[PDB]
């Protein structure tokens, strides 16, 4: 009856179906644009047609005279409130509405409020704006030239910024980590040395649901309530309170159901600030919901790193050092989401899964006439660029030594016995077992047979297709937490959970995180189910409402399972401890005299004497034992001691059509190890979504700008997104190496498929050209671009 009872809980390890589905499959979900309030008006934004220039004059009369238009605001209406500019997570400032000039195409210049989105759109076209064009800056290198135009005239005369000294007016910062002198020493005398320049293209998270909000200031009650597509509503609440002067307790921010975030909905966009201001001025609700073109064009982008990787080693493949130099294109304003002490995120995790004794990385961010961003799209704070850098370099090293790409990795892997491992960069990898995982994947796909096959096709000068095999062995860093190290605008990156057990046994739980579709309402419930012996079905979890949920830092960078997942277990355990104390009183025995068996406390050596969580709960409200307050609830704010370090071995086989340049993924095997698994069904979905995003990034996505600074391909007409036809069948596998420091040994996983899959595709494409000397080919790997390579290397048809 004990095996059945545990199973009936549908807690830890169970592939129970989602609790979220019921509403979503019947169209009863509640997203921002589904919201309608009494007297709600609609706001639309007048955007910049040029990339760089001075604003001569803005014409509001025609728009204002239009029936249904209530107001037209500009930066002039924002100055008196000190809101034409706003603070960013990066420590820089961003324009809410273009004041004296525009820094990027499609920038927010003015807003209109109307009865509905139809009249609003009209009002936007009716607003005429005159500009004086200025020389555009689109390339980071060209941006740092002496004669390069001044973009940020607002910070003219500042010799330092939020992240140290600034050497040029377009220079944002220079950050580094690792031992520089020691690294230079290895490279100065090392026998084997490889160098590779690579560009990680600017891409966009492009969530199906764009950004939006419904701001509502009630002049009677004197308080603001705004529904919003935010991945950190609590942080927004604190920020909105300070910028507006409205006491925080009178500010309520609520993230309802969100149609995907992926990092794109972490920041505060000028659209939100404008709606709030408009709402406060008109004394009524204002809705703002951007269109696809606006989301791709103006919200947080991802990547855009120009990297220079280097590897030093002995002829047998053993790596002695790593040296990296990056130029980061951050756009006009630096609004790149990251902990305040890390302007380049956690890029120093580029040591990867290898025991590299000496390393040093250096990132230099620069301004350009483009939209802000950098951190978004399942990246864990630049881990995507880190993994891509190291794996591409190891492939370069392997090809120079003519060594097998799997063999060279097995040679450099941090051994299982070395964990907890401290890298050349200072990270303390919690746990891992890369060799076992690698062998498993290689056997599963018959790696030697694939090599034998690739050898055969290469032998025939007439083989109509090229065969490429890609292999990535990566280590992720998820769970941004350690408050001494990580903070968002001063707030330590902890998270929380509050559980309240009702008189009848069911419970309500709220956390400081906010799901955007990853299944928190189900998984969180499963964690609590196993900790308290209460079925997950009746543990109602909720997130996103700053007036009810405990304060947290939100969901992004796969921090939920690591941080909130820990707060949930500990809070549950606080309740469990009190439950024992109460069970002891009822059974008239001592505490260490009781045994916990799935969902009850029983007397040791006497099964007939027990008390279930239901019995205890009622007792808690009925008659609290002496020295105990009535009730049965707890809260826990978890400040993590370390990050979580999940890993994976990804292998991909591609066949390239020599006549057209078309690349077809023949097979893709993904093995992920995120420690203790809460819900494998949910984990699998996250893998499928992440790998699909990777295929999107590596095979087709990009955000090209012309000479004049116009963003090309900013709609789904050109911005690549695979359909069921382009998406390959994914093969998944796993191993279980728990995080020792975690309350339930669980590691994050959502961002792993994204981080790891991207370099696997490039590894497969490049491996197809390896036999003719190709060391690297820049993304995206479209038919067009790949054909250009076939042409250049005389492999075309």
């Amino acid at each position: 009856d004990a095996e059945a009872r545990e199973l009936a809980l549908a807690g830890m390890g169970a592939s129970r179906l989602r609790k979220e589905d019921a509403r979503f499959i019947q169209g009863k979900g509640n997203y921002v644009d589904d919201i309608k309030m009494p007297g709600m008006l609609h706001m639309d934004i007048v955007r910049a047609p040029i990339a760089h220039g001075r604003i001569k004059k803005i014409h509001k009369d025609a728009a204002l005279a239009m029936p249904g238009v209530h107001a037209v605001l500009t930066a002039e209406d924002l100055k008196p409130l000190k809101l034409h500019w706003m603070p960013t997570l990066a420590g820089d400032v961003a324009a809410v509405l273009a004041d004296e000039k525009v820094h990027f195409q499609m920038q927010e210049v003015a807003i209109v409020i109307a009865d509905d989105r139809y009249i609003a759109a009209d009002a936007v076209e009716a607003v005429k704006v005159e500009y004086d064009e200025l020389p555009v800056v689109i390339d980071p290198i060209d941006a740092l030239k002496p004669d390069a135009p001044v973009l940020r005239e607002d910070l003219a005369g500042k010799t330092s910024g939020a992240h140290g000294p600034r050497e040029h007016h377009n220079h944002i910062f220079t950050w580094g980590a690792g031992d520089k002198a020691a690294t230079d020493a290895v490279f100065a005398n090392a026998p084997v040395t490889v160098s590779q320049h690579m560009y990680y293209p600017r891409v966009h998270p492009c969530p199906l649901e764009t950004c939006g909000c419904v701001a509502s200031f009630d002049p009677i009650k004197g308080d603001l309530t705004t529904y919003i597509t935010s991945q950190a509503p609590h942080v927004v609440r604190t920020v909105v309170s300070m910028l507006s002067g409205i006491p925080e307790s009178k500010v309520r921010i609520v993230s309802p159901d969100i149609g995907g975030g992926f990092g794109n909905k972490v920041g505060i966009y000028p659209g939100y600030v404008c709606a709030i201001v408009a709402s406060i001025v008109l004394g009524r609700p204002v809705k703002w919901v951007e269109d696809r073109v606006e989301n791709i064009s103006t919200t947080a982008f991802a990547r855009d790193y120009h990297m220079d990787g280097e590897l030093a080693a002995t002829p047998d493949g053993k790596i002695l050092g790593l040296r990296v130099n990056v130029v980061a294109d951050h756009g006009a304003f630096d609004a790149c989401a990251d902990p305040t002490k890390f302007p380049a995120g956690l890029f120093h995790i580029c040591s990867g899964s290898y025991d590299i004794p000496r390393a040093h990385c250096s990132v230099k961010g620069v301004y350009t006439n483009k939209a802000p961003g950098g951190v978004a799209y399942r990246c864990s704070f630049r881990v995507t660029e880190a993994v891509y850098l190291i794996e591409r370099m190891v492939d370069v090293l392997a090809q120079k030594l003519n060594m097998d790409k799997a063999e060279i990795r097995a040679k450099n892997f941090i051994r299982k016995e070395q964990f907890p491992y401290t890298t050349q960069f200072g990270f303390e990898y919690d746990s891992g077992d890369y060799h076992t995982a690698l062998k498993k994947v290689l056997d599963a796909v018959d790696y030697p047979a694939l090599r034998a096959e690739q050898a055969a096709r290469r032998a025939d000068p007439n083989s109509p297709t090229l065969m490429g095999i890609g292999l990535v062995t990566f280590t992720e860093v998820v769970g941004a937490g350690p408050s001494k190290m990580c903070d968002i605008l001063g707030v330590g990156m902890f998270d929380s959970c509050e559980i309240r057990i009702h008189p009848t046994g069911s419970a309500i739980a709220r956390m400081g995180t906010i799901t955007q579709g990853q299944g928190h309402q189900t998984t969180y419930a499963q964690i609590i189910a196993t900790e308290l012996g209460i079925p997950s079905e009746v543990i109602q979890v909720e997130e996103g409402d700053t007036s009810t949920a405990p304060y947290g830092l939100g969901t992004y960078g796969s921090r939920s399972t690591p941080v909130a997942g820990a707060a949930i277990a500990l809070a549950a355990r606080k309740i469990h401890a009190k439950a024992r104390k109460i069970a002891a009183h009822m059974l008239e025995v001592n505490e260490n005299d009781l045994d916990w068996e799935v969902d009850r406390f029983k007397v040791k050596g006497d099964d007939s004497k027990f008390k279930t969580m239901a019995d205890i709960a009622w007792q808690a409200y009925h008659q609290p034992p002496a020295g105990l307050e009535p009730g049965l609830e707890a809260v826990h704010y978890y400040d993590p001691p370390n990050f979580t370090y999940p890993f994976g071995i990804y292998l991909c086989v591609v066949d390239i059509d020599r006549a057209t340049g078309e690349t077809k993924v023949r097979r893709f095997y993904a093995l992920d190890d995120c420690g203790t698994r809460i819900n494998p069904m949910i984990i699998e979905g996250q893998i499928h979504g992440g790998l699909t995003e990777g295929y999107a990034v590596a095979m087709g996505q990009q955000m090209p700008f012309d000479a004049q600074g116009n963003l090309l391909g900013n709609t789904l007409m050109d911005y690549f997104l695979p359909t069921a036809v382009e998406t390959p069948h994914w093969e998944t596998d796993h191993t279980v190496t728990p995080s020792p420091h975690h309350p339930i040994g669980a590691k994050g996983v959502a961002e792993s498929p994204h981080v790891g899959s991207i370099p696997t595709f490039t590894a497969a494409v490049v491996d197809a050209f390896a036999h003719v000397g190709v060391t690297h080919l820049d993304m995206p790997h479209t038919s067009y671009r790949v054909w250009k390579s076939l042409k250049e290397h005389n492999l075309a048809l």
Binding site: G27, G259, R292, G517, G685, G689, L691, T715
Partner: protein
């Protein structure tokens, strides 16, 4: 000038007066509060707005409400019957064919019609038959499993 029209949505007559430029998607969402159908783009690619019109799958963001005077429109809010989930809704639930759920209403309406066009679809046919719907979360794998599940339930 607003035009008076009566649209049959989920078997119920909806008498409204809307400007001719009113896209069906906004009519369903704004005038009727049938906010299941969603907007994911402005170029007719995503399919998050897919509803069933006069027996065919149509992207409501590229169709006028004024062209539906007397039409039979089916939205996600109308798939269930007496509370019992339609095979297609059950399919997406049992097979975990949804995460954020933004493309779901559109996927369901499309799956509902696709399964009538082709009762016994192969995997390739499913992926192809569902090409007008974009999804950012699932990777499509569980979606084809969901459709295969719905297909089987409809034949039993």
């Amino acid at each position: 000038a607003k035009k008076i029209i009566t649209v049959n949505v989920n078997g119920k007559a909806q008498e409204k007066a809307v400007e001719p430029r009113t896209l069906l998607i906004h009519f369903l969402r704004e005038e009727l509060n049938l906010t299941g159908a969603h907007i994911g783009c402005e170029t007719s690619h995503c399919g998050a707005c897919t509803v069933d019109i006069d027996g065919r799958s149509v992207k409501s963001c590229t169709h006028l409400a004024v062209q539906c005077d007397g039409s039979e429109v089916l939205t996600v809010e109308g798939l269930a019957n007496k509370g019992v989930l339609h095979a297609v809704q059950e399919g997406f639930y049992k097979e975990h064919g949804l995460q954020c759920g933004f493309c779901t209403p559109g996927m369901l309406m499309r799956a509902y019609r696709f399964l009538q066009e082709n009762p016994n679809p192969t995997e390739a046919e499913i992926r192809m038959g569902m090409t007008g719907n974009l999804c950012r979360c699932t990777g499509y794998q569980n979606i084809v499993k969901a459709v295969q599940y719905a297909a089987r339930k409809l034949q039993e």
